[PDB]
Every structure is written in C-alpha cells, then in structure tokens.
C-alpha cells in the first residue's frame, strides 16, 4: 500500500521504500512536466551526494550531535518519519551541503588512487 507504512516506526517504514519509490512517476502536460522535474531533482541530489541507484546509501559525513540529540534507538523505534522530518527540517540545507563536499573530496581521492600504479 502506497504510504501504508507512513504511520509506522522509522525502522519498520524502511522496509517499504520500494513502494513509495515506484509511484513517483494542457494542464495534464503541465503536471506531468512538473512531476518529471521533481523526480529528476531528487535523482540529481542522490547522484551528487555519492548515492547511486540505491534506496539506502551510507556516507562519510559524521552526525553532528547538536541535531536531535536523543539516543539512536529512540529515533528508529519510537518515531515515525513525519515526526523525524519535522524535527530536523531546520538543518536539512546544512546536511546536503556537507554531503556535496564529502563526495567531491572522495572523488579527488579516488582519482589519486587511480593514478598510482
């Protein structure tokens, strides 16, 4: 069910990411164009951050303890994604910038490793 896990905990909700992902794709044309642009913006952000065609990607940016400093198990077991997204909304623009910086550094390092031989 689309968004069926929306009220479930973050851990449980992580098991249905495919369900939401597969449903993202004159007025009808305008709406189709905007839907496509939103899809592509999300795909571009995933690519730039170093995340390939995967639902879950782990990166090299450490967690800043000032953001939602409420244990680890409490977040995944007691909260839903709507509550979590609201709690850290004010830091979203910071995290994304850090992710971009990390990937650029990682690519530079990879090229050096590729040059060694």
């Amino acid at each position: 069910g689309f968004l069926g896990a929306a009220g479930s905990t973050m851990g449980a909700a992580s098991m249905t990411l495919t369900v939401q992902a597969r449903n993202l794709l004159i007025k009808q044309l305008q709406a189709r164009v905007l839907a496509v642009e939103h899809y592509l913006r999300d795909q571009q952000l995933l690519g730039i951050w170093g995340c390939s065609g995967k639902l879950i990607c782990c990166t090299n940016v450490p967690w800043n303890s000032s953001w939602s400093n409420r244990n680890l198990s409490e977040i995944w077991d007691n909260m839903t994604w709507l509550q979590w997204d609201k709690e850290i909304s004010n830091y979203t623009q910071i995290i994304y910038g850090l992710l971009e910086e990390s990937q650029n550094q990682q690519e530079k390092n990879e090229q050096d490793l590729l040059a060694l031989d």
Binding site: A6, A31, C57, T59
Partner: protein, 432 residues
C-alpha cells in the same frame, strides 16, 4: 559515533497546491476531455496518522471553480449568437383570462427578425416570461440588452451533472479525512490515502444543496467562523429531504432561422391550461430536519437563546430565491414558506418562476439564452444541505450565490499533499 544515512522513498509529505486532472466514465461537463478512470480504485488506510485539514483554505475548491467556468465557456463558444434579437419588442399579455398568480407572467412579443438573406425581415411572434423582458416605453426589450450580448446555448449539449473524479498527478497524493462528524477544520485521526477522489457532481444551486453527500451520523454545522456572522454556514444533513419540482404545462417549441447556418429556438405556445411551476416538500420531513438543525445550532449558540428562521432580505433573484436546473430549464423558487418559523427550547408547495436569460457565476457582461424544452418537466431530487447566514434571539436566513461554497460542502474531506521521498537519519555505518 553516529553517521549520516540518506534514505530515498521515505513515506513523508508536505502541504502543497498543484494541478489536478479529471477522470470520468454531449454534456457541458464532457467526458471526452478526459477518461483516465479506474474501475477499482484503492484506499490505503494510514494507521496512527493524524493530519490537520482546513476546508476554507483548500485550493481544490478554487481549482474546481476555474475548471467549471472553463468547461462552461468551452461549451457555450461553438453556439448560435443572438445579437440580432436585441430589438424593440411589441409585447402584450398572453392570456388575459387568468385569475391565478400566473396572469401577467408570460407575454406575446412581436418583433422584426433577420432572415437568412440580408435584404428581408420576418415578423415573428414569440412568448417570453416577464422576468426576461423589461419595459422601456408596450415597447419592451430583453433584460440583457444594456449589460451584455446573449449567446444561445447549443440545443444538443446536456446540462445534466456527470460525476467528475479528481486525480492527483504522480508525486502527489490525496488525503481523505474519513472521520465521522468532522467539522471541516482541525485534526483528523482516520486519514486514508487515495490517488483519485470520489465523483463529485457539479450541481448548481443556491440556498439548498441538492444531490450532495449526507452526514454519516448527525447534522454537521460547518463554518469558517461562528462568531463572525458575515461567513456562510454550511449545514450537512443526516438524511435527504425529497423535493419534487414540476412545470405542469405542455409547452410547444417553435424555431426560426436567423442568417446562414444558424437557428433560433423560442417558446412557442402552451397546449391545454397554463399552470405555475412549483416544488413539493413533505411538511413532516422538513420539520424534523429543521429541528435537528436547530439542536445542533443551539450547541454552538446556547441552550437559552431562540433560533428564528426568516426569508432572504433582498438582492438579486439568484440569492433571494432557490435556484436549480431541472430538465434544462432554470427554476427560481420562493423559499419564504420554509424559513418562516421560530424554535424555542400533507405537502408544502413552493411557487417557482421560469426564466430563459441566465447570468451565471455572477459574471457581468456575459449571458446565456436557455432554449425551451418541449413537454412537461418533473425532477425528483434530494436536499442534502443548507447554506444559512446569521443576522437574545439569533435570526438565520437562507443565502448563497458564491458557488465555491457548494463545492466546499463536498471537497472539505479531501486535502492534496506533495510526496518528498528524501530523508536523513543517524545510524552506525562508515560507507565502506
């Protein structure tokens, strides 16, 4: 210790305003424009999800309003123009030997109309309702001749409402409150997600909402602000009240041609006796329904105040009378017989008038001529809600005229949200 992980496909959303598309299974609300229907739509219940709704700020109502206006104009554009008809009319009384309230309501108007050839004129007699004809000094003109040019509706396009399903585009979803006795605002703990709404009929009326949805358990009184008496109060009934509206006369329709490739339809004559149009509402059903409304209204205003109903104070006929489309004819009915009692802690007959020149949607500068329909017209419909306004005694009157409120009474349960499937969360991983 903890690391950032990016999750794509996260089941979250944010409030948004977007463009919705139509689906359906000639008509003004044509099904040719769109048919992306779904014989088996799904509803995914969201457990442990509470969302806030506000029916008074719901962009779906404004979008529907524009969609209805656009479809209306698209239907009227490819039709016969009646500009040659705005002439001086020589009008007399159709049937002087009438003693009923009908006497003087319809007139015998003689005028010189353009023929197919531009050189000749034809003398045409036609029968018009007095509400469409104004005296200038005999010597009458059509009521629209100063304000606007009038376009004849195409005789082949039906005015019968057809349910329209609204569907969100990909990336968006529609949240249905699905909560009994929800007042249209505030939190809703039983929200379900759909891609398409149920069908909504674009029924056009004032004062009384016809063929709408019924309350699940009891009469629901919805208002943007109860204290502010300038807002309309939308009352959703628990049970329908059946109304039988008839025009009990056998009308004969005649037509003439005006110019090449054009034809004008006009009310020709009446066979048999001429009788007044009217609507029948059962007295007991209405009295019980009104009592239920009063009890719910007292809950908002207090057990110790008196609730009094009165007829509309004045203004345009579209707002002082009940208005509806029955059989293709436009009926205007006097509702003073219903809102005439005071509440302290057989059949009713409403007379109606028929007019052919309609200024819909309160747009000044445009007008439509509704062609007459041959024969006898009867409709049976359900009254599902009321539009009331407020003046130690609270006085309420019927009202309306702002068509958006008729759609609010149906769209209040739906909200449009945008899906934003990107989340960030802490975990214990180091990429590789």
């Amino acid at each position: 210790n903890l690391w950032v992980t990016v999750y794509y496909g996260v089941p979250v959303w944010k409030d948004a305003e977007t463009t919705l598309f139509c689906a359906s299974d000639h008509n003004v609300w044509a099904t040719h424009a769109c048919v992306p229907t779904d014989p088996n739509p799904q509803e995914i219940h969201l457990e442990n999800v509470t969302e806030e709704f506000n029916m008074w700020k719901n962009n779906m109502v404004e979008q529907m309003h524009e969609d209805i206006i656009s479809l209306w104009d698209q239907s009227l554009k490819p039709c016969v123009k009646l500009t040659p008809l705005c002439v001086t009319l020589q009008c007399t009384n159709y049937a002087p030997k009438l003693r009923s309230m009908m006497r003087g309501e319809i007139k015998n108007c003689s005028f010189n109309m353009t023929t197919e050839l531009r050189d000749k004129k034809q003398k045409v007699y036609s029968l018009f309702y007095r509400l469409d004809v104004v005296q200038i000094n005999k010597e009458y003109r059509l009521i629209n001749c100063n304000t606007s040019a009038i376009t004849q509706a195409c005789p082949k396009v039906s005015f019968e409402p057809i349910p329209i399903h609204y569907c969100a585009p990909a990336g968006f979803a529609i949240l249905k409150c699905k909560d009994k006795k929800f007042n249209g605002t505030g939190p809703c703990p039983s929200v379900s997600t759909v891609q398409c709404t149920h069908g909504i009929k674009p029924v056009v009326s004032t004062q009384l909402l016809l063929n709408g949805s019924l309350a699940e358990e009891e009469v629901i009184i919805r208002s943007e602000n109860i204290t502010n008496n300038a807002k309309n109060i939308l009352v959703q009934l628990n049970t329908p009240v059946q109304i039988n509206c008839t025009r009990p006369s056998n009308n004969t329709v005649k037509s003439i041609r005006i110019g090449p490739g054009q034809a004008f339809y006009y009310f020709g004559d009446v066979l048999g006796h001429v009788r007044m149009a009217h609507c029948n509402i059962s007295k007991a059903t209405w009295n019980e329904t009104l009592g239920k409304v009063v009890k719910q209204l007292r809950k908002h205003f207090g057990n110790n105040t008196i609730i009094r109903f009165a007829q509309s104070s004045g203004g345009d006929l579209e707002v002082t009378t009940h208005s509806f489309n029955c059989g293709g004819e436009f009926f205007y009915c006097n509702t003073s017989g219903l809102f005439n009692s005071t509440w302290i802690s057989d059949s009713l007959i409403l007379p109606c008038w028929i007019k052919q020149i309609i200024n819909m949607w309160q747009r000044i500068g445009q007008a439509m001529y509704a062609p007459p329909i041959q024969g006898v017209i009867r409709c049976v419909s359900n009254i599902t809600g009321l539009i009331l306004t407020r003046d130690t005694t609270e006085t309420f009157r019927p009202g309306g005229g702002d068509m958006r409120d008729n759609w609010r009474s149906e769209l209040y349960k739906y909200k449009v949200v945008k899906i934003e499937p990107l989340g960030v969360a802490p975990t214990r991983c180091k990429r590789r």
